[PDB]
């Protein structure tokens, strides 16, 4: 079908060969840093529980949920 010119463009290669890894690396950094973590709030292996009581907290809571979550996270 269509799409085989640009991919065979050569200039395309230029523009993207510079852009793609550029992106691939930004995320790989967004992941390594922690934003990935701190924005999506997911727990780093380190933060599950608190080594002194389990309760997969809930939540429970609620409200008041949030406020509740906050404390939860904090105490953790």
Binding residues: 16
d(CA 36, CA 72): 20
Site string for another protein, 25-44 (x = CB under 8 A): xxxxxxxx---xxxxxxxxx
Interface with another protein, residue 23, by CB under 8 A? yes
Closest CA to 58 of 45, 46, 47, 68: 68
Among 11, 18, 46, 74, binds another protein (CB under 8 A): 46
d(CA 71, CA 39): 18
Tokens of 49: 């529980």
Interacting residues toward another protein by CB under 8 A: 1-3, 5-6, 20, 23-32, 36-49, 51, 54, 56-58, 65-66, 69, 72
């Amino acid at each position: 079908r269509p799409f085989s010119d640009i991919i065979t463009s050569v200039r395309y290669w230029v523009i993207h060969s510079i852009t793609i890894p550029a992106l691939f690396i930004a995320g790989w950094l967004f992941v390594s840093t922690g934003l990935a973590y701190d924005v999506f709030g997911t727990p780093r292996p380190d933060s599950y529980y608190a080594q002194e009581q389990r309760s997969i907290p809930l939540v429970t809571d609620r409200f008041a949920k949030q406020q509740v979550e906050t404390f939860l996270e904090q105490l953790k």
